[PDB]
Symmetry: C3
């Protein structure tokens, strides 16, 4: 299954960003259809991916550790 | 079927917004993959949903009533 | 197959834009689920389409000619 989400890294942490292309490269390398750099969002300036496969971790409620 | 669209409420009216998370919560609660708050768009500052199921009303050409 | 991409015109050139609705109309007329006007991106201010069918050309690495 796929989902639109903030791609995460160890452990439960978003990827920050400035440029859309940075996030699109990151997200698509990880199987998403595309992604972009969301500014001033829930997790600050962070990468949002569309249709990211569920073998890739995502940000969920809770702490980044 | 699903479509990308402005989610609507009675009758043929968009949801205004400030924050992306507001729209993402609204859109996903209604079955969309995600959504965001479009600023300065066709209907002002309004929620846009990706892959919103067709059992949820959307904004179509015409008046909000 | 579909892909998220910059819709292109002859030859390997993006469509520039100001308004999201301009790009959404262009992209959806060409079979995409939606599109928007990306500002200050890889190709300047240009139209990005979601789920654009592969019978529509897209921007790929290289020169616009
Ligand atoms: C300023 C600004 C801005 C923006 C944006 C966006 C988007 N998509 C990727 C959700 C369509
Ligand atoms: C007003 C200028 C907008 C450029 C910033 C674009 N983002 C990187 C925030 C795309 O979501
Ligand atoms: C230039 C700062 C951008 C933050 C606004 C982001 N929106 C809420 C308009 C996202 O589309
Ligand atoms: C800060 C105001 C944002 C309006 C510009 C929106 N775009 C046309 C860049 C949408 O991506
Ligand atoms: Cl985080
Ligand atoms: Cl943004
Ligand atoms: Cl927020
Ligand atoms: Cl309205
Ligand atoms: Cl916007
Ligand atoms: Cl408009
Ligand atoms: Cl170009
Ligand atoms: Cl943008
Ligand atoms: Cl760039």
């Amino acid at each position: 299954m796929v989902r639109d989400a903030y791609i995460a890294k160890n452990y439960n942490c978003v990827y920050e960003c400035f440029r859309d292309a940075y996030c699109n490269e990151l997200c698509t390398k990880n199987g998403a259809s595309s992604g972009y750099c969301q500014w001033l969002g829930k997790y600050g300036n962070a990468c949002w991916c569309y249709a990211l496969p569920d073998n890739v971790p995502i940000r969920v409620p809770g702490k980044c550790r």
